[PDB]
Structures are given as C-alpha cells and as structure tokens.
Design a protein around this ligand. Structure first.
Ligand SMILES: Nc1ncnc2c1ncn2[C@@H]1O[C@H](COP(=O)(O)OP(=O)(O)OP(=O)(O)O)[C@@H](O)[C@H]1O
Ligand SMILES: Nc1ncnc2c1ncn2[C@@H]1O[C@H](COP(=O)(O)OP(=O)(O)OP(=O)(O)O)[C@@H](O)[C@H]1O
Ligand SMILES: Nc1ncnc2c1ncn2[C@@H]1O[C@H](COP(=O)(O)OP(=O)(O)OP(=O)(O)O)[C@@H](O)[C@H]1O
Ligand SMILES: [Mg+2]
Ligand SMILES: [Mg+2]
Ligand SMILES: [Mg+2]
Lengths: 92, 486, 468, 483, 118, 119
C-alpha cells in the first residue's frame, strides 16, 4: 500500500501545482488590472508571490514523492523476485 | 516400545529415523525429559520440532513414541496459574490437578453445533461496547502499531469480568485465558500483577511462551490456551481468550517451517499460515443449547508496522475475525484514548451483542462518527458552513470527547448507557467540548449518589423504560443548573 | 577422539568425529592454522549436528589458511569467559582474553557464555524512574532503573553520543559495576571509550568487552553473550547493581543473519535468519533484573537504511521498557538529541508512576507535537499563513517546544565546545507546562535551542533581544 | 606436487577437484596465468572465484597451488606504479621489485593498538580543511551523486601531499594509494595524468579494476590497495588511501554472491556486504606509538542515486566511517564547486586534528554558513557576508592550497575584509591577494606554518597588507574595494 | 442504452461524471479549501456530495447493524430521483438528508425532520 | 574496431537501443538460471555494460564515437539499467517535439541537453 499511497500523493500534488500555477498567473494579470492565499500579507502581488512559492513547493514535493515512489517500485520488484526465487530454490 | 534415533539436529529441529508407527503430530520423547512433535513424515525420517531445550539433543540419541497426538491437561485447577504451552506450571506454585486431557487439534464446532452470538461481553470501554460491541462466542481482533493500547484493552476487558465472577452464576461468569506469545518475561509478570490487583487471577489463566522460549512453544501457546478454554466452553461455561499476540506466533511458525525446509510463500511465511490462524480462531464459538450453551470469545492481537494493515498476517487475521478494533498512534497522541479508528473498526455481530438500552442509545453512533470525521476533513478550510454542517461538527466533537476513557477505568453497562444517552440524545450540546468529559463524570456520579434507580432499571431490565428516560432527562436538566462550565 | 575438518565455507567449518565422540551443541573445539602470517588457534563453536557424526561449527576467528583434514580437538565445554571483580578495569575480547594485559584473568573463575535466562518466578517488573537530566528523556521517555532502555537510530543520528551521554550521567556517580559491550562497532570508538573512562576514573568500575566490525560473524554474534555473562555474574553472585551498555545489538542480529546464511538455513524475510526472533529473545531475556538484583541495560539499536520496519529493530522493540527512537528528520533540524518525541515510549510514563502533573504535561506536549505533525502536509505547500488562528498559535508553540526538547549534552562538548547542562525533572515539568500554556510564546524560537532549564532560556532570550 | 583439475566452470566461478592440502582463501593458478581464490572447500571439490579472465578457464584444465593465502606483493617499489588487484603492473613499465608479500585479510589493529587521531591530513580544499577537517588515521566518506566532483576532491587531496613529500621526513610524508574500482579506463588515465603533472606519482600507487574488469577484480581491488598501504602504515609511515568507489565494489561482491547462489537481502545485496566494507575500513587506523605510530587515512567514495543518502550501501558506509563530505548535485550545477553541503557534512574525529590558526578562523565560518543557508532560503548584512563566504569556499580543480594560505583566505572571509569587495570578484581578489603575500610579506605564511598559530603581530601585519592591497585592487565593475 | 434505455443510461453517465469530477477536486478542496473552486465547481461539489450520500441506502440485512429497517426503491424512482439530483433540484436540502434513506419520500421526510423542505 | 585499428579511420557507432542490450543480457541471465540482482537485472549488469562501453574509446590517434539511444524504464533515471548506462555517457542530446514544431532543425532541446566537457 506504500506505492499506492505515494502515487495518490503524487496525483494530489500535481493537481495542487496546476492550481497554484494558474492562480499565480491570474494574480500576475490582476496586478496590472477576503481570500487567504496571499501569504503573510494579512499577518494581488502578495498572492502572486505566495502562489509562486506554493507552486514551487508543490513541484519540490512532486519530485521527492516521485523519488520515493521509484524506490518503492524497485524495492517491490526486488522483493517479489526474492520470494519467487526463494520458493524455487526451496523446491530445487 | 517403538524407538527411533536422532540422525541430525539443530536450531530446535531434529530428524529421527525409525518410529515406523509414529503419527502425524505425535508427541515424541527425547532423552532428558525433552519433548518434540512429528511434523514431517517421509520414508527416510521424521522431522520433529523440539518443544523445550534442544541444546541437549544429540545425534544418536534414542527417541520414543508417546502414542499421543499433541494434548494438554485441562481443568479448573488452571485458574490463577501461569503455565507453559504444555500446561506445566511456571509460576513456582506446584502441580496443577488436571481434570482431564484435551488434544490440541480437536475440531471446531460445526455449523449445526452453534447458535447465534446474542450475549454481550462487556469490556467496560465505552467506545467498544457502544460502537464495536463484542458478544459471547465472537472473535474481535485488536490490531494496531506498537504502544497503541492493545494489551490495555484486552486486560481491561479481563478485569471488567470481576463482577460477573463474583455473582457466582456460571451463565454470567467469564473465565479468562491470557496467552502471552513472544513477550518479555517481565512484561508477562506486569500483566499478571495488573490482573492480581484487580482480582482477575481468581478466574484467569495465563499460558506463557516468552521470547526466550523455543519457536515450538511460541507456535503452540495459542492452541494450548484454546484447548484449556475449550474444556470449559464445552462444559457450559463462558470463556474469554486473549492472544497477545498472533503476529509472533506466525513468526515462530515461519521459523519452524523454514528450519524444516518447507517451501516459503509470501514474506517467507509457509503456505498454511492463514490455516494456522483460521483453525485456531474458529474454535472460538457460541455453542448451541444442545451442547450446553457455552462459549469462547476470542480477542486476538495483531501488531502492525508503520500502520500497514496490508501486510500478510494482518490481512489474514482481519479476514478471519468477527470485526476489529483498529488502534492508531496518531489518534492516541491526539488524546483519543482508546485510540480506536471509528471509520474502519467494526463488529460483525452488531446490535445482537448489546443489551436493548445500549442498542437504542448507540444505534447509529458508529456511522455518525464516520460521517463526522469525513465532514471534519472536508470542512477543514470552509468559511461560513451550513447550519446543519456546523451542528454536525459540534455534535461529533462532543461524541468524540464522550468516547474518551482512561486506562483501568471501566464503566458498568448502565453507566455506559447513560453516558452515551447524554451525547446521542443531544444533552451535551449545551456543554463546551472541553468540559464534556468532566460533565459526564459528574453526571454519572450524581445519578450514582441519587436517582440510582435509573441504573438499577437499566441493569435489571436491560432496557431504558420510557419513564426512566423521562426521569433521566429531568435529572440531567436539573444537574446542568449546578454544573460549572469552566 | 579427535575430529577432522571436512568442509570450510568462510567462517563455518564442518568437522567429522568418530562415532560416539560427536561434541555437544555449543561446545568449543580447537583447530590450528599453521600458515606463517595467519598462524593461529581457531576456536570453533558447535552449531549443528549434521548426522553421520559430522558437526557444523562457527569459527570465532577468520578461517583463512585452514586446511581440510586438520585435527580438531573438542574441549568438552562451551566458550567460557573469566568472571569476578578482577574483570573490572580491563578490556576483553569475546573469548575472554584480556587485551590490555594479555594472560590476565586466566586464573579467574570462568563461566560458560551460554546459560538459561532467569526463571519466570524470579522476574519482577521494574517501575522506578532513572532520572538523567535530559529534558526529552525525563519528560517523554523516562528511563527505568533496573529496566531495559534502547536507543534506535539510522546511521549517524547520535546513538553512540547518547550512549556516552548516559555513561556520563548514570555510570560516573554509579555505585555498582558497569559492563560495556562493543558489538560490531568501530574499533577506534572502543579505544576512545577506553581512554575516556580511564580519564574520568570510571574504568576501575567497568569491564569492557569488544568484538568490533573487523571480526568474523561468529565473534560478533557471541561477544554480547560474553559481556552479558560478566554482567550476570555481577548480578547474581556479587549482589551488585549493574549497568550494561551495548553498542550495537543490531550488529548481533546482523552477524546472526550472516552466520545463518553460511549455515545453509533457508532465509526468512529480507534475507534474515529464520531464528531471528528466537536468537534475540534468548539474548534479551538474559539481560534483565530479577527480584532484588538489578541490571539497568542501555542498548543502541541500529536501524538499517532508516527503515524502522526492518525485521531486526522491529523484533527488538518488544524487549524494552523504554525506547528512545532517534530520527533523521529531527537530526536534520539540528535538534540534539535527535529524539522523535512521538515515536519514543516508556512503560512508566503513566500517572500511576510519575504522577498527575508529569503525565499531564507530557501528554499535552505530545498532543501539540502530534497536531503540528498532522499539519505538515499543508505547511509544506502553503506555510502557516493559511492556518486558523488556533492552529497558527499551536504551530508557533510546537516549534518552540520541539526546539526546547533539544539540549546541550555533556558528550556534545567535544563537537561544539559548549559544556552540557543538567535539568532537574521538576524544572523540566514546570518549564514545559509554561511552554504548552503559551507563557514563552513571545520569545524567539532560537532562544529555546540547545539549552538547559529556564535560567538558560532567560539568558539566551536576553542575548537575542527578548526577555523572560 | 598437488595438481587439481577443473570439473566445471561458469560465470567467474570454477570448481576444482583434488588439491587435498589447499588452504582456505589460497590463490590457485589456472593455465594461462589465470588466478583464483579458494572460497569453498568441501570433500568433493574446491569452489574458486576467478580473479582475471574467466573465459580462459576450461573443464579438465590443471590447477596448481601457490602455497600462499590470498595476498599481494608489497614494498616501496609500488610508488609511482599502476597495478591490478593482484599487484601485477599494468602501466607497461616493467617488473615491480616487491619487498615481501602481505595477506589481504589480516585483522585490523585492536582497541589497545591504536591512539587518538591528532595530526591533520591537509586536503588543500578550503571547505573540507575548514569545516570537516581530516586527521591522519581517520576514515572520511566522500558521498554524492554521479558527476558531483568526488574524484576531484580525492585527487586534489593527493596532490596536496607534494609539499609534505618533498621534506623527506617520514613523519610528515604521506604515501598515497588510489584504488579505482569499476571506473572507466579513460578516467583512470586522466587521474594518473593529473597526478603526474602535479608531481604526485612520486608518492602514489594506483590499483586499477576498471569498468571492463570482471567482478572478482572489482571486489578484490580495495583489499589490494589496503594491503599495500598497510605494509607502509605498520612501518611507521603515514598513508592515504582513496577507494573510488565502494558502490561499485559492493555491486561486484553482490554479483559474485548471486553467482554463488547465496540468498540476498536488501537491494539484493548479500547479508555480509556490510562486513565487506567494514573490515576494509577498519584497517585504516592511527597506530599506537608502540606499533610505530603509522597511520592510514581512508577516503572511501560512495555514489548515491538522486542524492538519497538513506539507501542501504550509503548508510552502511556512513555507519562505518568517521564523518562524511556530502557533495550535492544542486550546488554543483549552481557552480558551487567543490559542492560540499554544510548541513550534512561533518568530521566526527577531525576536530582535534586541526591546527590552531585554522580552528580560530573557521569556528565561526561553520556557523555563519549554516545559518546563512536557511536565511537565504527565505540580516541583509549577514546575507552579504554569507554570499562572500560561499564565494570564498569555491575553489578551482587541481589547485590545493597550503594550510597557511587557507588560514589567510578564511581570515579574509571571516574578518569582514570581503564585505567591501564585490561578490563576483571575491575569488579573484583572494587569489591575487594570496599571490601578493607570497611575493612580499611571505614571512606571514612562514610564521603560521612554523607556529601553527596566528599571532597578534602577524594578524596586525596581515590586516595592514590587506588594506594596502585593497588600495590598488581593480574590481571587475571598476569600483575601488577600499574600506 | 440498448438494454437499460436512454434515460437510465444518461442519468447513470451523468452521476458517474459528477462523481469523477468530485474525486478530481477532492485534493484541491483538502489543501486550498472549497472557496478557491469556481462557482460551477462548487455547484458540482455540492451536487456530488448529495449524490454520493443518496447512493447509500438502508438495507434490510443491515438492520442489525443500524437499528433501522431497510428500504426498497423501484428502478423508475431511482432514475427519476438521480436525474433530479444531477440537475440540482435538491441542492437546497442539507447533505445529511440524503444519508441512509430509500426513495424521494424518505428524502422529504428526513429533510423535514432536519428543518428543510422538499 | 576494425575500422579504427586496422584502417586508421574515425568511426561513428550508433546503438539503438542500448537498453535492449541490457535487457537481452537480463533475459539470457534468467534463461541460464542465474539469480536476478536488484530490480531483476542480471548480477553482471555493470560488468557487461563496461565490457561493451570501454571498447568505445579513442586510441592511437583514432576514435570510435558512439551515439546511443537510451530507454529509461518508468522514466526512473535511478533504475539500474539507465544508471549503469549513464555511468559511461559523456553527453546527452534530447530532441524536442516543441523545437521541431517550430521548424527548428535539428530539434535539439538546448536546455534539456547537456555535455560533460562544457567546462
Ligand atoms: N485508555 C488509555 N488511556 C491512557 N493511556 C493508555 C490507555 N490505554 C493504554 N494506555 C497506555 O498506553 C501505553 C501502551 O499501552 P499497551 O501496553 O496496552 O499497548 P500495546 O499496543 O499492547 O503495546 P506493546 O507494543 O508494548 O505491546 C501504556 O503506557 C498504557 O498505559
Ligand atoms: N549532541 C550532539 N551535539 C552535536 N553533534 C552531535 C551530537 N550527537 C551527535 N552529533 C554528531 O553526530 C555524529 C554522529 O553521532 P554518533 O556517533 O553518536 O552516531 P550514531 O548513531 O552512533 O552513528 P553510527 O550509525 O555511524 O554508529 C557525531 O559525530 C557528531 O558529529
Ligand atoms: N573544484 C572544481 N571546480 C570546477 N570544476 C570542477 C571541480 N571539481 C570538478 N569539476 C568539474 O566537474 C567534473 C566532474 O567532477 P568529477 O569527475 O570529480 O566527479 P565525480 O563525482 O567523481 O564523477 P563521476 O560520477 O564521473 O565519477 C570534472 O570533470 C570537472 O569538469
Ligand atoms: Mg501489548
Ligand atoms: Mg555509533
Ligand atoms: Mg569519479
């Protein structure tokens, strides 16, 4: 279930990255021209910077998750082979 | 008598030549009082698992048949005793007067030798008794990561049977068997002390196969405990058996099977590990009235790693038992204790394992909490939710508070009925979330001090009469005036 | 009555004996390697009876240079090590040979390194706090005097430094005897420990047994038993309070796996020996207090490839009273000791043993850190700005708490030049009560890093610009 | 004499019947000068791992004893030579007149045969020599992704020993062994060329098991280099051994184990791959004075995949060595070279083996950089200082610095003398300035080198010289860097 | 369409499309909240939550697990009810009204018991 | 090699696809009953690749230069086959659909492509 979970996380992170990127570009448009995606502004330009940061973080997260997923993929192949060959060796 | 000879030996396994008439799973005597069991029988030799101290086994030693399949002594003398998987005392308190002997592999009751599970086995834990109720004859898996409270649930269930024991009525009494498999000796000693303080050793037996035991003893301990329980079950008694835990028994069986060089399966487990657990757990049953009406309730424990219930042994055992209480580290650390994951914990007997009052108050509690958790996740970043959504969230937070319970703090079934009634019938809504617990604690105390007839009515009739409901509602409303909501 | 080598497969040797003279399991046999540079006397340990009067044995020394057909002599007993007050202050190898004084101890009483664990009826659960002065240990993972403590961690997260810390905090003012087992760890770490103990005047109360990385798997599997035999003698015969330090017990399991492979056994999961749990259980159940006879054991458990689900540490968990799980993620943040407060545990962290206040404060710390962990997915993308005011407040509190669980350690001075600190348990409880209640929310986060008690907190907050 | 015969042969393994008197791990000669090591000895045959051209092995071939456990020739004649893991020359320069032979699997010095690491092993790399100092007898892991500069660090360290060599004092000289395991032949040739141009082959031996070699040679190469080095170390010499890289050796050993049908574990590695690396690296030690005080410093190289230091082999080696220099691909591609990562890079035991002047100038440097990284992730003055420090730690390949020059450069960075200088010129600035101090005021370097300390008078003169240099330093931008 | 007919098939496909879109949006709703969705996507999310709840049903064999007797909904009522749900005709009812009921009469009764009206 | 060593020519050796060479080696290893290594590849993966690649070299003033199509399983560059291959690669040329669709030939992606001697 580790690989299934990692794939689900990768899908979620991809959707988030797409949304944040669209928000960043729309905030760029609205700069030339309530909500909480403005970063530390409460604590358009600020939303643009916050969405840039968020989409970059989503990209970093996708890369890390993909690395972990590929490690799990390789480990699963190796383990499955180990079980198959262990059984075959037992019978041989 | 027929004699074979050891031809090779190591790591708790031996191979014996001769013994032409040995049976499958026969007990074998090695020199020095060491016993073994014949697992592999082929033309050349018998592969035997040593149940004890194999370092004394040598090539050329004489091995004798016993003519007996694996069996253990059984009787009422095992109550209050700690034994090893052969039924031999290890508590240093002398011999145990056995009533008789039982073969470990006697078959489970058939479809027509049973009747439906219909008697509650109260744990004293609100979350379990209201949301995953356990009946007599049920197998309820307690599964979770290390230190999530699995042993605490099982030991508190054992301790909650003291009142039933004191009644003296064998149709009410529950005798308890605690099988410790692969546990460190001091942990078993601490469990025994906990049982002793609560007066549970009067009706409890501990079958112990600590981590220092041979893999054979660890493999056998669940079956030994099951046979001891079955002797009572078939004599019209009610038995609760705890296996703490079956993960280690599966590992011990895998060790034995690999040492015998049987071909491994998934995770190197033998092909029949599912069978190992299923044939054990199907012996827990609710017997029909023709066979005495006895029962044995099973509480197997499974330890998962990294909250991975998809591993081989957890999946097997989940697919065997009549429901599971899933304990989570994240819930535990949040303060949800017992750390039951309500969405995925289920009882497959359901309301049949509850008294009428509990069934009525706790009707849809589990689905309500499941939907509450779903909504909580969905409404995490919602601003200005619906009125209905806000009401659902408030009620669910109150219910979650209501189901929190400290260790060694059992509630009688009537107290649980009243506690649940508070939440599900809406009487906690005026109470702040953070005070919910306190409120319940003080309300029950109040009903205990006065209006104790509400508890008496629930206890004696198993249902909350309309007039008792009216009185309880009035008592709650009166108590709320004097309650200080911090 | 002598046997002869018939097979050699690395550190495992098959030996034939005349019928009737086959040695017993665990007997020590002796063979000779005569090749000049590698000349030595091999100690073999009988591991299996193969049949036809053949035994399979594990060599305690490398077998390089051994020849088929050479004579093998059965000593008639298992490997035994010298015991008594004389072993204190001296360094030994897994066979009981003194390394700092060769020949020393040959005249002492010798005990077989193989024995049964204490009878179940002699076992007594231990619930008594061993106060360390480390904030995180005392608060969240209180150690047990006479109990079993483990330090889990991946490669280089601070296990050995924490073992040295606990030697400093527990062994130095100890009144009883100490036994240190180096199992499959760095030889220079052993030399460093020897020198450090001599400097601190603790060596005279300590027996050091080393079988380190550059040893055959048999020595790495038996050295722990040798050290444990010395500890058992001190516990049972001398009626002494004993400390037992082991670094690293995972190396014992790993050596067992190597040996099992050589012995021809079918592998279990992840290539481990089928008897992994059983070997570990024998060893661990020997390491224990009995009624009136106390051993406090501290063991470092290596976690392969940072995989806490690996079968070796996973099996080790059940044998412990207190478990400090070091985390790579904590280590990466500069938090020393790199304790994972949510994964560590103590069997005595419950109100009955430590009291209501300690338990409540520990539980509130754990709740806050758990909530912070649950928010990490959201924070990793958006930061704290999207959180609700309650969650923002909790996150600030949790960051300060997780910093304040760090501590300048005594053994860390060699790395940072900063002397360590000791915090009384009462002060730790009070300080974390204030922290969870939000009384230090105004102080900057860095003020909570690598300090001791509240006085240090005030001084560092001042040095930064705030004021407590 | 005893003559065995090949009964079967496959995939670098052979089985030989006969040779009743063969020893475990003995070297066996197969026809055509092929060698094998007797791994498994039973009553039917000897399993042998072929070290060399396995394709020449045939059934029925005669096999002869060597009478020698697995061993290599050792002696001073190996300096400046390139050999294979058997000690046979491959540089085409004739025979190597060996002093003696040394068995490959001799045990490491015991806990009581060592002493604390206390003498620095200067790498000439400012980042390492300042932040992860290496003492003689220490094992420092060089770990990183492919093409992150690992070989460059190790080769620069070897090149840095030329000045020590020229003194002729065996207490100061460092003899170098460079083991190439599974490396492309062209890269070994380039390494040898760089060592020759730097005058380093005089005191360096190369053990080569290139990518085209069979697994037996790749598995053996580190032990051969270690034995060559140990011969010198036990004779009171100081040795530096580079294993480039141990990932490939682990792969070779895994191949050999699988071909022997040993059941694997994690990542299909044999259960004793940890032992493979740990017994190798345990033999790098700082000997006690009773044993001569010699030392062997190990620089194992590990290649990670995608910067994953939590994998099995990297964690094994991390748990063997006394610290690691983590080379980050992100830094390398940003032009930060050598691409050392401060957060993960640490010297466990080299803190003591650092001259006093370097300690004084670098103790702050460590903290400044560690905190500047987190700040830059997101004061302004500390940002400028951190940029200047990151610039200062950059270093061209093949140009190690003497410790006195490193002290002066770290002084410049740490004492704020670069706050005035443009970032883009810091490098050039430092270079020219150091050259100035060599041409004139060279007594500063002499004082530091003799005393190993930075004196108050020498520090004052250094500041004066820095100001005079700033007077006439032409920034690329054109602006003066004065004050 | 050839077997179940055009109405059944179209309603089924619309339900599936809505639930698929909701599953696509769940991660965004979890991280960034629902207010960041488009108004049309918010409409779809409300419809989808009601639809998924209305696919649940009180089954007879589940009485023992809920205390509630089961219900049976004719095919025609199912098709008409889900056609209405996909069109947004019940968006004014709380989502909890759709949980563990039978047909539209049960829906009206449960909504009344929760305050709203069908 | 004959062209380089006997005819004294410079040779361009194209290999499409080198991954299929690695995989054929894995299949042969399986057929011969060898225990698979990590991710199921032959235990001698690196040795086989080295034996092939180290013959592609410059020597005696003439060279064999190789352009090799590489398939990356699962797009995972840490997969043993692409990792072993890239241990020998000196440059990468990525042809981009985007660049081709602009009429730019050769359709080399100037940002994705790289070389180890551009220093
Ligand atoms: N309801 C509870 N409230 C508070 N603490 C509890 C509760 N239940 C259990 N605990 C504590 O949680 C810790 C773990 O409990 P327990 O030993 O029963 O768990 P486990 O899953 O069986 O553990 P192990 O992995 O050691 O076998 C113990 O300290 C116990 O006191
Ligand atoms: N308290 C501390 N303060 C500062 N640095 C520390 C501290 N603890 C550990 N370190 C750093 O971490 C390094 C590793 O510590 P330690 O040797 O205890 O790790 P380990 O877990 O035993 O490692 P291994 O798996 O390699 O044996 C130490 O050399 C030191 O650099
Ligand atoms: N200090 C440096 N300054 C500038 N360029 C450098 C430096 N070190 C290395 N390089 C460049 O980086 C290239 C790769 O470095 P190097 O070969 O040392 O890395 P590696 O990690 O050992 O590589 P591989 O994976 O090929 O073995 C070198 O060819 C050189 O071009
Ligand atoms: Mg438990
Ligand atoms: Mg360590
Ligand atoms: Mg390189």
């Amino acid at each position: 279930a580790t690989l299934r979970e990692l794939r689900g996380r990768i899908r979620s992170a991809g959707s988030i990255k797409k949304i944040t990127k669209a928000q960043e570009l729309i905030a760029t448009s609205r700069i030339a021209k309530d909500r909480g995606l403005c970063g530390a502004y409460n604590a358009s330009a600020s939303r643009r910077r916050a969405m840039k940061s968020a989409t970059d973080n989503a990209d970093d997260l996708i890369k890390a998750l993909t690395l972990a997923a590929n490690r799990e993929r390789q480990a699963q192949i190796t383990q499955e082979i180990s079980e198959i060959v262990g059984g075959a060796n037992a019978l041989a | 008598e027929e004699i074979g000879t050891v031809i090779d030996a190591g790591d708790g396994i031996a191979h014996v030549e001769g013994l032409p008439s040995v049976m499958t799973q026969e007990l074998l005597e090695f020199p020095g009082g060491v016993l073994g069991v014949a697992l592999n029988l082929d033309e050349h030799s018998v592969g035997a698992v040593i149940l004890g101290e194999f370092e004394k086994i040598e090539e050329g030693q004489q091995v004798k048949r016993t003519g007996e399949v694996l069996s253990v002594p059984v009787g009422d003398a095992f109550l209050g005793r700690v034994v090893n998987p052969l039924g031999q005392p290890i508590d240093g308190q002398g011999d145990i007067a056995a009533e008789t002997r039982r073969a470990l592999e006697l078959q489970a009751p058939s479809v027509v030798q049973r009747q439906s599970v219909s008697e509650p086995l109260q744990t004293g834990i609100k979350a379990i008794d209201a949301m995953t109720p356990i009946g007599r004859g049920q197998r309820q898996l307690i599964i979770g990561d290390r230190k999530t409270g699995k042993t605490a649930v099982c030991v508190d269930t054992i301790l909650n049977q003291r009142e039933a024991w004191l009644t003296g009525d064998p149709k009410q009494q529950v005798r308890c068997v605690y099988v410790a498999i692969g546990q460190k000796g001091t942990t078993i000693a601490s469990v025994k002390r906990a049982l002793e303080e609560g007066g549970a050793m009067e009706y409890t037996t501990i079958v112990a196969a600590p981590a220092s035991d041979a893999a054979g003893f660890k493999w056998l301990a669940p079956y030994t405990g099951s046979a001891i329980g079955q002797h009572w079950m078939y004599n019209g008694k009610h038995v609760l058996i705890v296996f703490d835990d079956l993960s280690k028994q599966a590992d011990a069986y895998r060790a034995i099977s690999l040492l015998l060089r049987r071909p491994p399966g998934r995770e190197a487990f033998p092909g029949d590990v599912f069978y190992l657990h299923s044939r054990l757990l199907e012996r827990c049953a609710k017997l029909s009235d023709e066979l005495g009406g006895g029962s044995m309730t099973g509480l197997p424990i499974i330890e998962t790693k990294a909250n991975d219930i998809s591993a081989f042994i957890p999946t097997n055992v989940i697919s065997i038992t009549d429901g599971q209480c899933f304990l989570e580290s994240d819930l535990f650390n949040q303060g949800v204790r017992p750390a039951i994951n309500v969405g995925v914990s289920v009882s497959r007997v359901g309301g049949a394992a509850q008294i009428k009052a509990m069934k009525e108050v706790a009707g849809s509690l589990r689905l309500d909490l499941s939907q509450y958790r779903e909504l909580e996740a969905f409404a995490a970043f919602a601003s200005d939710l619906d009125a209905a959504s806000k009401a659902q969230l408030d009620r669910g937070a109150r219910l979650v508070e209501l189901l929190k319970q400290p260790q060694y703090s059992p509630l009688a079934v009537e107290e649980q009925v009243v506690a649940i009634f508070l939440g599900t019938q809406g009487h906690l809504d005026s109470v702040p979330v953070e005070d919910v617990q306190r409120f319940e604690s003080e309300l029950l105390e109040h009903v205990k001090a006065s209006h104790s007839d509400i508890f008496d009515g629930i206890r004696e009739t198993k249902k909350l009469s309309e007039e008792a409901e009216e009185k309880l509602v009035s008592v709650i409303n009166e108590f709320k005036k004097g309650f200080q909501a911090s | 009555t002598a046997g002869r080598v018939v097979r050699i497969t690395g550190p495992v040797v098959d030996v034939e004996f005349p019928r009737g003279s086959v040695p017993e399991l665990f007997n020590a046999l002796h063979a000779e390697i005569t090749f000049g540079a590698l000349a030595k006397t091999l100690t073999l340990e009988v591991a299996q009876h193969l049949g036809d009067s053949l035994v399979r044995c594990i060599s305690m020394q490398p077998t390089d240079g051994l020849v088929r057909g050479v004579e093998v002599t059965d000593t008639g007993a298992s490997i035994s090590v010298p015991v008594g007050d004389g072993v204190k202050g001296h360094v030994f190898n897994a066979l009981g040979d003194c390394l700092d004084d060769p020949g020393y101890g040959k005249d002492f009483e010798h005990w077989s390194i193989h024995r049964k664990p204490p009878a179940f009826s002699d076992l007594e659960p231990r619930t008594e706090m061993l106060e360390t002065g480390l904030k995180v240990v005392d608060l969240l993972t209180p150690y047990v005097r006479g109990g079993k403590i483990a330090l889990f961690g991946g490669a280089g997260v601070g296990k050995t430094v924490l073992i040295q810390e606990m030697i400093n905090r527990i062994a130095r003012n100890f009144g009883g005897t100490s036994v240190f087992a180096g199992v499959g760890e760095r030889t220079r770490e052993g030399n460093d420990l020897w020198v450090e103990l001599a400097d601190a005047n603790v060596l005279k109360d300590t027996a050091l047994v080393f079988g380190q990385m550059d040893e055959p798997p048999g020595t790495r599997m038996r050295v722990a038993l040798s050290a444990l035999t010395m500890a058992e003698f001190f516990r049972d015969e001398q009626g002494q309070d004993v400390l037992l330090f082991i670094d690293n017990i995972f190396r014992f399991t790993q050596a067992g796996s190597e040996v099992s492979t050589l012995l021809g056994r079918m592998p279990s999961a992840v290539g481990y020996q089928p008897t992994l749990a059983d070997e570990m259980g024998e060893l661990q159940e020997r390491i224990t207090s009995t009624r009136g006879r106390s051993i406090t054991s501290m063991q470092a458990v290596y976690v392969p490839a940072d995989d806490y689900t690996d079968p070796a540490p996973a099996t080790t968990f059940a044998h412990l009273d207190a478990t400090t799980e070091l985390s790579r993620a904590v280590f990466s943040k500069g938090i020393f000791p790199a304790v994972d407060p949510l994964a560590s545990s103590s069997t005595i962290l419950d109100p009955a043993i430590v009291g209501d206040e300690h338990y409540r404060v520990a539980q509130e710390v754990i709740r806050i850190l758990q909530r912070y962990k649950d928010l990490q997915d959201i924070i990793a993308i958006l930061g704290i700005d999207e959180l609700s005011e309650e969650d923002k407040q909790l996150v600030n509190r949790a960051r300060r708490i997780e910093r304040f669980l760090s501590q300048n350690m005594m053994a860390a001075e060699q790395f940072t030049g900063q002397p360590g600190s000791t915090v009384p348990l009462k002060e730790t409880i009070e300080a974390f009560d204030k922290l969870t209640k939000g009384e230090f929310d105004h102080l900057p986060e860095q003020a909570f890093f690598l300090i001791g008690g509240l006085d240090d907190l005030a001084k560092k907050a001042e040095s930064l610009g705030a004021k407590l």
